[PDB]
Design a protein around this ligand. Structure first.
Ligand SMILES: O=C(O)C(=O)CS(=O)(=O)O
Ligand SMILES: [Mn+2]
Length: 615
């Protein structure tokens, strides 16, 4: 077979055999094993510069940073091309796209046969979770994209140290990726190779992941969504733990007590902002620290507590909207050593995106930019056509250790105990600012039934309300109704210890007024809601019983430093009977679709809410 160039530190016979089999199938010109060093990163970045995929940014303005721009067909996740190919269709469920595995294997084999002709196969070894810790799991991604290799170096623990952990017999998650654009001898490549035809396929029984045609984000960085959510949710369902689309933060009040909170918001609905929240005026003595902004692996312990870890090593965050008001910790994080994707280029070799003008003199747009499609951009063009200099799904990739607010336990494999869960969709109407569930079952209900308006994080029409249970609609690895039962069963195990269960909240930062603008100021002001949750955790916070749960009164929040009247508070906390009667009918349609294995407790909770609305 082809010379694999297998390094001497690879002692795993089964792994080498697997690579040999994949090289026989994909037929790359050469094979390169990524060792994960900083020196290699710089070499691969310089290689990307030569290919035109990367532009190096001005070293004086943005040290050791690069900008990539993608093909306009390859800018986001493609949910319609993402499949869970379980042996039985009922174990994919109605929220997933399924195909008989042998039938998908016959569909993909011609696509991957020779997919890497004219290209290099990069072997990308990685650990999700701290290296060699009891909770970590190892993957190997074979890819023909050097863009994948360098982004994986930031987002995971990548490289030769993985093989010390694997040893001769360790198991691993097998991942194969190709941009699906094989090159003929002497053929000129493009700056962003991709294919109009795309598949992102998961075989849960074998833990296999196959990705074809996209080089972008969660389609191609296979440790992040494919492994650490879709495959990991199957593993945790069988082994007693959870893999969740949740940030994890720590918060310390002036008396020095520290709590931790996990929040599930859908894609591009404020996780990165909340996980790095800076307390505003009126909260002297409070501090917020980040454990993670996207993925949480959680399991119960004998002491009755729920322990969470962040399995990633960096941030892959939405760029537009980031500035010193909305997320200063993130602004400081991306001062250097960052990869930017699909943002705009300034005349001085820096980057720009919509929202940055809030920090500019006169809050004014730049005079001239090159947009993410390479076209000239000016404020006049933006005024007359609304052209976006940065694509709405543009991204920064940056190490977690760049974050000034990073928690000291961010990479502690013992985890942090979770004192409260938060669920929240992007809802222009109906859902109030914050509600505490009356019981664990009612909390699971609120998580199961949450809705959210679609965003640019996946292709398709943005701004449409859809059901997104637990913010896991694009990421649940098995039948969504069985997952609801898993959460119910987890609560029973915790309660049997005698412990008090974590509280569950529903939030909504995104109610709109008649002009389409947000009625709640949000961002740093979200601390005022978080501090009520802390009060409630301590047993010191008051609240009123409403239809959907317990909500604070105006006098229960701290308004020092914010001019927000009791009338504006009533607007974002009033439970509107008609809006909720309509909302509960949309829950019934969900329950009809998820009828198979749907826990009876959800129907019972719905009937109790229906009674409270008709009272
Ligand atoms: O869309 C999301 O939820 C993300 O975190 C971005 S991606 O990794 O899916 O590209
Ligand atoms: Mn995400």
């Amino acid at each position: 077979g082809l010379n694999l160039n297998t390094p001497a530190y690879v002692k795993n016979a089964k792994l080498i055999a697997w690579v040999a089999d994949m090289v026989a199938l994909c037929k790359p010109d050469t094979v390169y094993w990524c060792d994960g060093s900083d020196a290699e990163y710089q070499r691969l970045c310089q290689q990307l510069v030569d290919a035109g995929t990367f532009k190096k940014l001005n070293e004086a303005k943005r040290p050791n940073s690069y900008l990539a721009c993608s093909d306009p067909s390859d800018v986001a996740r493609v949910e319609d091309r993402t499949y869970i190919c379980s042996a039985k269709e009922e174990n994919a469920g109605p929220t997933n796209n399924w195909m008989e595995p042998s039938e998908m294997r016959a569909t993909l084999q011609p696509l991957f046969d020779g997919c890497m002709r004219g290209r290099t196969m990069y072997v990308v070894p990685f650990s999700m979770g701290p290296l060699g810790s009891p909770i970590a799991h190892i993957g190997i991604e074979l890819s023909d994209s050097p863009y994948v290799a360098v982004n994986m170096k930031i987002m995971t623990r990548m490289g030769k140290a993985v093989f010390e952990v694997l040893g001769t017999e360790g198991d691993f998650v097998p991942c194969v990726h190709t941009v699906g654009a094989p090159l003929a001898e002497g053929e000129q490549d493009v700056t962003w190779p991709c294919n109009k035809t795309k598949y992102i396929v998961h075989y849960p029984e074998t833990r296999e992941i196959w990705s074809y045609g996209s080089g972008y984000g969660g389609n191609a960085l296979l440790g992040k969504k494919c492994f650490a959510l879709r495959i990991a949710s199957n593993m945790g369902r069988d082994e007693g733990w959870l893999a969740e689309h949740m940030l994890i933060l720590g918060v310390t009040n002036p008396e020095g007590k520290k709590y931790h909170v996990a929040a599930a918001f859908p894609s591009a609905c404020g996780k990165t902002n909340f996980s790095m929240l800076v307390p505003p005026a009126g909260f002297d003595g409070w501090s917020v620290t980040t454990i993670g902004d996207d993925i949480a692996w959680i399991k119960p312990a004998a002491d009755g507590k729920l322990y969470a870890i962040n399995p990633e090593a960096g941030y892959f965050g939405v760029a537009p909207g980031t500035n010193m008001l909305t997320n200063p910790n993130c602004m400081l994080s991306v001062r250097g050593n960052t990869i930017f994707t699909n943002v705009a280029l300034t005349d001085d070799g820096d980057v720009w995106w919509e929202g940055m003008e809030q920090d500019a003199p006169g809050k004014a747009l730049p005079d001239h930019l090159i947009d993410w499609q390479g076209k000239d951009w000016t404020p006049q063009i933006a005024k007359e056509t609304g052209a976006k200099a940065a694509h709405p799904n543009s991204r920064f990739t940056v190490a977690a250790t760049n974050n000034p607010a990073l928690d000291s336990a961010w990479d502690d494999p013992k985890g942090v105990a979770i004192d409260a869960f938060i669920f929240g969709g992007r809802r222009s109407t109906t859902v109030p600012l914050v509600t505490e569930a009356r019981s664990w079952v009612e909390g699971v209900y609120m998580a199961a039934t949450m809705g959210s308006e679609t965003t640019a994080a996946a292709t398709g029409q943005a701004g449409v309300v859809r059901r997104d249970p637990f913010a896991m609609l694009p990421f649940m690895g098995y039948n969504m109704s069985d997952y609801f039962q898993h959460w119910l069963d987890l609560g029973k195990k915790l309660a049997a210890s005698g412990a008090t269960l974590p509280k569950i909240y529903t939030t909504n930062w995104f109610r709109k007024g008649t002009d389409g603008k947000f009625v709640w100021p949000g961002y740093g002001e979200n601390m005022r809601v978080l501090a009520w949750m802390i009060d409630r955790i301590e047993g010191k916070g008051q609240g009123e019983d409403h239809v959907t749960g317990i909500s604070p009164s105006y006098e229960d929040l701290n308004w020092t430093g914010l001019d927000f009247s009791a009338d504006q508070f009533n607007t974002v906390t009033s439970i509107d009977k008609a809006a909720w009667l309509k909302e509960l009918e949309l829950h019934a349609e969900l329950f009809k679709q998820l009828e198979h294995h749907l826990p009876k407790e959800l129907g019972e909770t719905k009937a109790e809410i229906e009674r409270r609305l008709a009272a």
